[PDB]
Design an enzyme around this catalytic site. Structure first.
Site, mmCIF file in Angstrom:
data_model
loop_
_atom_site.group_PDB
_atom_site.id
_atom_site.type_symbol
_atom_site.label_atom_id
_atom_site.label_comp_id
_atom_site.label_asym_id
_atom_site.label_seq_id
_atom_site.Cartn_x
_atom_site.Cartn_y
_atom_site.Cartn_z
ATOM 1 N N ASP A 248 -4.370 7.136 -6.990
ATOM 2 C CA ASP A 248 -3.952 5.703 -6.992
ATOM 3 C C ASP A 248 -3.655 5.149 -8.373
ATOM 4 O O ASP A 248 -3.256 4.005 -8.486
ATOM 5 C CB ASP A 248 -5.030 4.868 -6.268
ATOM 6 C CG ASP A 248 -6.347 4.734 -7.013
ATOM 7 O OD1 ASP A 248 -6.516 5.442 -8.016
ATOM 8 O OD2 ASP A 248 -7.123 3.884 -6.525
ATOM 9 N N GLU B 185 0.789 -1.214 0.000
ATOM 10 C CA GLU B 185 0.000 0.000 0.000
ATOM 11 C C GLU B 185 0.824 1.270 0.000
ATOM 12 O O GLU B 185 0.390 2.324 -0.493
ATOM 13 C CB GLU B 185 -1.009 0.008 1.109
ATOM 14 C CG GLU B 185 -2.011 -1.117 1.025
ATOM 15 C CD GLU B 185 -3.050 -0.984 -0.049
ATOM 16 O OE1 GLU B 185 -3.361 0.133 -0.399
ATOM 17 O OE2 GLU B 185 -3.617 -2.028 -0.474
#
Length: 149
Positions: free
Chosen positions: A26, A17
Protein backbone atom coordinates in the site's frame (compact mmCIF):
# COMPACT_ATOMS: atom_id res chain seq x y z
CA UNK A 1 -27.25 -0.31 11.24
CA UNK A 2 -29.23 2.85 10.98
CA UNK A 3 -27.76 3.58 7.61
CA UNK A 4 -25.79 1.54 5.16
CA UNK A 5 -23.36 2.83 2.51
CA UNK A 6 -25.16 3.81 -0.64
CA UNK A 7 -24.32 2.43 -4.04
CA UNK A 8 -22.72 5.79 -4.88
CA UNK A 9 -20.77 5.60 -1.67
CA UNK A 10 -19.52 2.14 -2.47
CA UNK A 11 -18.49 3.31 -5.93
CA UNK A 12 -16.58 6.23 -4.44
CA UNK A 13 -14.77 4.06 -1.89
CA UNK A 14 -13.94 1.56 -4.58
CA UNK A 15 -12.50 4.35 -6.73
CA UNK A 16 -10.23 5.34 -3.85
CA UNK A 17 -9.25 1.83 -2.85
CA UNK A 18 -8.89 0.23 -6.23
CA UNK A 19 -9.61 -3.46 -6.89
CA UNK A 20 -6.51 -5.53 -7.21
CA UNK A 21 -6.15 -9.26 -7.93
CA UNK A 22 -2.67 -9.47 -6.47
CA UNK A 23 -1.52 -8.53 -3.00
CA UNK A 24 0.39 -5.30 -3.17
CA UNK A 25 2.30 -2.92 -0.94
CA UNK A 26 0.00 0.00 0.00
CA UNK A 27 3.03 2.28 0.15
CA UNK A 28 3.88 1.79 3.78
CA UNK A 29 4.56 -1.92 3.56
CA UNK A 30 1.11 -3.28 4.38
CA UNK A 31 0.09 -5.98 2.02
CA UNK A 32 -3.35 -5.18 0.63
CA UNK A 33 -5.58 -6.93 -1.86
CA UNK A 34 -8.99 -6.67 -3.44
CA UNK A 35 -10.66 -3.38 -2.57
CA UNK A 36 -8.49 -2.30 0.31
CA UNK A 37 -8.50 -5.57 2.23
CA UNK A 38 -5.71 -6.24 4.70
CA UNK A 39 -7.35 -8.79 6.98
CA UNK A 40 -9.64 -11.48 5.59
CA UNK A 41 -12.96 -12.14 7.40
CA UNK A 42 -11.53 -15.24 9.07
CA UNK A 43 -8.73 -13.15 10.59
CA UNK A 44 -5.96 -14.24 8.25
CA UNK A 45 -3.75 -11.35 7.25
CA UNK A 46 -3.12 -10.55 3.62
CA UNK A 47 0.33 -11.58 2.51
CA UNK A 48 2.61 -10.91 -0.38
CA UNK A 49 1.85 -13.42 -3.11
CA UNK A 50 -1.87 -13.75 -2.34
CA UNK A 51 -4.36 -13.58 -5.17
CA UNK A 52 -8.03 -12.79 -4.98
CA UNK A 53 -10.95 -13.25 -7.34
CA UNK A 54 -13.56 -10.53 -7.93
CA UNK A 55 -16.09 -12.51 -5.89
CA UNK A 56 -13.65 -12.94 -3.03
CA UNK A 57 -12.78 -9.22 -3.12
CA UNK A 58 -16.45 -8.29 -2.95
CA UNK A 59 -17.06 -10.55 0.03
CA UNK A 60 -14.08 -9.16 1.92
CA UNK A 61 -14.98 -5.57 1.12
CA UNK A 62 -18.54 -5.91 2.20
CA UNK A 63 -17.45 -7.57 5.45
CA UNK A 64 -15.15 -4.70 6.36
CA UNK A 65 -17.60 -2.08 5.11
CA UNK A 66 -20.20 -3.42 7.54
CA UNK A 67 -17.76 -2.98 10.43
CA UNK A 68 -17.20 0.67 9.56
CA UNK A 69 -20.87 1.30 9.01
CA UNK A 70 -21.45 0.03 12.52
CA UNK A 71 -18.83 2.44 13.88
CA UNK A 72 -20.36 5.43 12.14
CA UNK A 73 -23.92 4.50 13.06
CA UNK A 74 -23.01 3.96 16.71
CA UNK A 75 -20.51 6.76 17.25
CA UNK A 76 -22.26 9.59 15.42
CA UNK A 77 -25.12 11.12 17.39
CA UNK A 78 -25.83 14.07 15.09
CA UNK A 79 -28.27 13.75 12.20
CA UNK A 80 -26.67 12.64 8.93
CA UNK A 81 -27.54 12.87 5.32
CA UNK A 82 -26.84 9.81 3.27
CA UNK A 83 -23.97 11.63 1.59
CA UNK A 84 -22.48 12.47 5.00
CA UNK A 85 -22.78 8.86 6.15
CA UNK A 86 -21.10 7.63 2.96
CA UNK A 87 -18.24 10.14 3.37
CA UNK A 88 -17.70 9.20 7.01
CA UNK A 89 -17.64 5.51 6.14
CA UNK A 90 -15.09 6.17 3.38
CA UNK A 91 -12.91 8.01 5.83
CA UNK A 92 -13.27 5.36 8.50
CA UNK A 93 -12.48 2.57 6.02
CA UNK A 94 -9.10 4.28 5.65
CA UNK A 95 -8.31 5.56 9.17
CA UNK A 96 -10.08 2.80 11.13
CA UNK A 97 -12.64 2.85 13.85
CA UNK A 98 -10.37 3.86 16.72
CA UNK A 99 -9.03 6.88 14.88
CA UNK A 100 -12.53 7.91 13.90
CA UNK A 101 -13.86 7.46 17.41
CA UNK A 102 -11.19 9.58 18.97
CA UNK A 103 -11.15 12.23 16.27
CA UNK A 104 -11.81 15.97 16.62
CA UNK A 105 -13.96 15.38 13.52
CA UNK A 106 -16.39 13.31 15.52
CA UNK A 107 -16.32 15.72 18.43
CA UNK A 108 -17.33 18.59 16.22
CA UNK A 109 -19.82 16.50 14.29
CA UNK A 110 -21.57 15.42 17.46
CA UNK A 111 -22.00 19.08 18.40
CA UNK A 112 -23.87 19.55 15.20
CA UNK A 113 -20.96 21.45 13.71
CA UNK A 114 -21.13 20.09 10.17
CA UNK A 115 -18.77 22.63 8.71
CA UNK A 116 -16.14 22.08 11.36
CA UNK A 117 -16.47 18.32 10.91
CA UNK A 118 -16.12 18.70 7.12
CA UNK A 119 -12.92 20.59 7.58
CA UNK A 120 -11.56 17.92 9.90
CA UNK A 121 -11.53 15.40 7.04
CA UNK A 122 -8.54 17.29 5.78
CA UNK A 123 -6.30 16.48 8.76
CA UNK A 124 -6.37 12.75 7.95
CA UNK A 125 -3.81 12.90 5.21
CA UNK A 126 -1.08 10.65 6.63
CA UNK A 127 0.18 7.16 5.89
CA UNK A 128 3.20 5.84 7.78
CA UNK A 129 3.22 9.15 9.62
CA UNK A 130 3.78 11.08 6.38
CA UNK A 131 1.49 13.26 4.34
CA UNK A 132 0.44 11.35 1.25
CA UNK A 133 -0.83 13.33 -1.68
CA UNK A 134 -3.36 10.64 -2.69
CA UNK A 135 -4.87 10.97 0.80
CA UNK A 136 -4.92 14.75 0.50
CA UNK A 137 -7.00 14.29 -2.66
CA UNK A 138 -9.19 11.67 -1.10
CA UNK A 139 -9.96 13.75 1.98
CA UNK A 140 -10.91 16.70 -0.21
CA UNK A 141 -13.27 14.45 -2.17
CA UNK A 142 -14.83 12.93 0.94
CA UNK A 143 -15.29 16.41 2.40
CA UNK A 144 -17.01 17.52 -0.83
CA UNK A 145 -19.35 14.61 -0.62
CA UNK A 146 -20.04 15.33 3.05
CA UNK A 147 -21.04 18.88 2.10
CA UNK A 148 -23.09 17.81 -0.94
CA UNK A 149 -26.88 18.35 -0.95
Amino acid sequence: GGKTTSDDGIDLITSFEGTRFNAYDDGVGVWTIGTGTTVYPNGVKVKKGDTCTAEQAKTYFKHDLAKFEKTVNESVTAPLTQNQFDALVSLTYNIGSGAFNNSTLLKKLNKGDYQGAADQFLVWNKAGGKVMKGLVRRREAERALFLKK
